Each structure stands twice: as structure tokens, then as C-alpha cells.
Design a protein around this motif. Structure first.
Motif, PDB file in Angstrom:
ATOM      1  N   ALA A  23       2.440  31.795 -17.880  1.00 52.57           N
ATOM      2  CA  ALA A  23       2.330  30.365 -18.149  1.00 52.57           C
ATOM      3  C   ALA A  23       2.140  30.082 -19.633  1.00 52.57           C
ATOM      4  CB  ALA A  23       1.172  29.769 -17.348  1.00 52.57           C
ATOM      5  N   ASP A  59       5.180  29.159 -23.240  1.00 49.57           N
ATOM      6  CA  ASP A  59       5.487  27.995 -24.066  1.00 49.57           C
ATOM      7  C   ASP A  59       4.509  27.866 -25.227  1.00 49.57           C
ATOM      8  OD1 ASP A  59       7.476  27.481 -22.181  1.00 49.57           O
ATOM      9  OD2 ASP A  59       6.201  26.111 -21.033  1.00 49.57           O
ATOM     10  N   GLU A  60       3.226  28.108 -24.973  1.00 56.63           N
ATOM     11  CA  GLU A  60       2.179  27.887 -25.961  1.00 56.63           C
ATOM     12  C   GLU A  60       1.946  29.086 -26.870  1.00 56.63           C
ATOM     13  OE1 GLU A  60       2.089  27.637 -22.818  1.00 56.63           O
ATOM     14  OE2 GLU A  60       1.630  25.574 -22.226  1.00 56.63           O
TER      15      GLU A  60
HETATM   16 CA    CA Z   1       2.697  26.331 -20.023  1.00 54.45          CA
END
Ligand code: CA
Ligand code: CA
Ligand code: CA
Lengths: 50, 105, 104, 50
Positions: A37, A40-41
Motif C-alpha cells: 500500500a 504510492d507514498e
Molecule cells: Ca496508498
């Protein structure tokens, strides 16, 4: 950008596992699996953003 | 303050007092490693697993854990013509004289 | 005071790795810290480059920075963890514990 | 016992030549003194050979 406080733990997790160490590409996909997850970051932390 | 990188370093032998036994070369570029070693340690240089962990701990609490250090990771040689302690003239290749790449350790 | 190996306790939960590292929960990794000034002790196994840099640093510290105290030998440790694919793995990780320090 | 300002140049000269690197526990104890020459008295303490 690379959020050091948010990505420090998980990014280092993938490095000691000998992932995210190639340059753009071969390991670009096994690296994304490890971050999950946080891809993206934290893509900028290893320059795998494409 | 930039990160760990290779910087210029001019070595002049006469300035060091070695002109009395080194015939040639009298000077050469040796480079040096200097810079910040903070997270993220650039992954394409393959830092040791210890440096990776230490950098993480340094990022968690820099007050308690110091960071890794920017040092040479790959050095190349140069040949030198000098006079050894026995007054013999020698043309030898000295190892680990020039820095080729830097890395955090 | 000079370059030497000091203690460093690694606790995985403190680093947020308790969610994928099963065991060990902690281990001693040590770290290298200290001064690197002339004379560099020969047991540190300094490179010929480090020797010269230390000399130049001693002649004019304003112009040349000193070498740094870093690990020169490292040993591995075995770890049981869960990889990104939910597989359980018992692997020996290299360069985990510091065995000797040296100026470079 | 080791004058750093007086011994820096000549001591380093013998080190890069791979001299004065043995321990008295001796082989190079004599080749080291030859390299230092007159500075042996004033620089023996720098390499623990006295
Ligand atoms: Ca994310
Ligand atoms: Ca001289
Ligand atoms: Ca976590």
C-alpha cells in the motif's frame, strides 16, 4: 516526495531483503510487491516511480 | 550540505615532504568521500545490511543512534617511481590510491 | 576515544519490524565510532588512500577532512521472517554484526 | 612520546610502503627502523616499536 517518517521502516524492510536495488527494469515489480500500500507514498525513496 | 558523494582531492607530494624519495609523479588526483548519510540510503550502490539498519535506527532517534559514514567503497591504484629505504630505484603500483566510488557504511 | 567498536542493541519492535520478523526479537549489531587522527593504528588495516588523507588532514585540517571510523569486518545472523508473499523463510543475512572497525 | 608534527611525513612514508605494520608478538621491527632513519628515536613511539 519521500516521506521519511512514514517510509523509513517499510522501505528499509525491502532493502535488507535485497529488493529495490536495481535501476530503471528487472526488480521494479518485486519491489512494488514488498512496499504494498505504501508504493504510492514511497516510490520516490527508491526511484521506482516510472 | 549535499549527500555522500565523491569530491576533489589534489595530492601534492612535495607539499607533504615526500619529494626527497618520490621521483614521479609529483602529484595526482586522489578524490575523497564526504557528505550526509541519512535515510534513504541510495539503493543502487548496495549498502551493507548493517548500514541499512543503522540508518533506520538513526532515522528513528538520531539523538540516540549516530548515522553511517561516507567512505570510499572502491579504490583504484597508481604507479609510482621512488627510492626505497635501500637506495634502490623502484617502479611499483600502489594499491588503494584513488577513490572510484563512495558509499555509506 | 579513537576508532573502536561500541555496543548497539537492535530491537525489531522498536523499528516497527515486529509485523514481519518472527525471531530473533533483538540482537547486538555494534557500531564503529571514534577519532581517526594520526597515527592510524595499523591493526585498523587502513587503505593507502586513508593513510594519505590522514596525513594531509594532520598538516592542514582546514583544507582536508579526516577519514571516518566504519566497520571493516562483518558477520551474519539467521532470521525467521515472512516475505512479501506471505511465505515463511529462515535465511542467513550477511553483514549484520560488526566484528572490527577501521578508519577509511 | 610521539611528536605528530615532526613524525607525520616520515611515518606515513613507511606505512604506505607496507612497513612498520607488524606486531612485536618480531619480523619488521628492523625494516621499520631503517625507513625512519634519524627520526627513529623521535618517532619510535608512533608505531609502538620501543
Ligand atoms: Ca496508498
Ligand atoms: Ca622529506
Ligand atoms: Ca510496520
Amino acid at each position: 516526495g519521500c516521506n521519511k517518517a512514514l517510509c523509513a521502516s517499510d522501505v528499509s524492510k525491502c532493502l535488507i531483503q535485497e529488493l529495490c536495488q536495481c535501476r530503471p527494469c528487472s526488480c521494479c515489480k518485486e519491489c512494488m510487491l514488498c512496499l504494498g500500500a505504501l508504493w504510492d507514498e514511497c516510490c520516490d525513496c527508491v526511484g521506482m516511480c516510472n | 550540505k549535499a549527500r555522500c558523494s565523491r569530491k576533489a582531492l589534489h595530492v601534492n607530494f612535495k607539499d607533504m615532504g615526500w619529494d626527497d624519495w618520490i621521483i614521479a609523479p609529483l602529484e595526482y588526483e586522489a578524490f575523497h568521500c564526504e557528505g550526509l548519510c541519512e535515510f534513504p540510503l541510495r539503493s543502487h550502490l548496495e549498502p551493507t545490511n548493517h548500514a541499512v539498519i543503522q540508518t533506520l535506527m538513526n532515522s528513528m532517534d538520531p539523538e540516540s543512534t549516530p548515522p553511517t559514514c561516507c567512505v570510499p567503497t572502491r579504490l583504484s591504484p597508481i604507479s609510482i617511481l621512488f627510492i626505497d629505504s635501500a637506495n634502490n630505484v623502484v617502479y611499483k603500483q600502489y594499491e588503494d590510491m584513488v577513490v572510484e566510488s563512495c558509499g555509506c557504511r
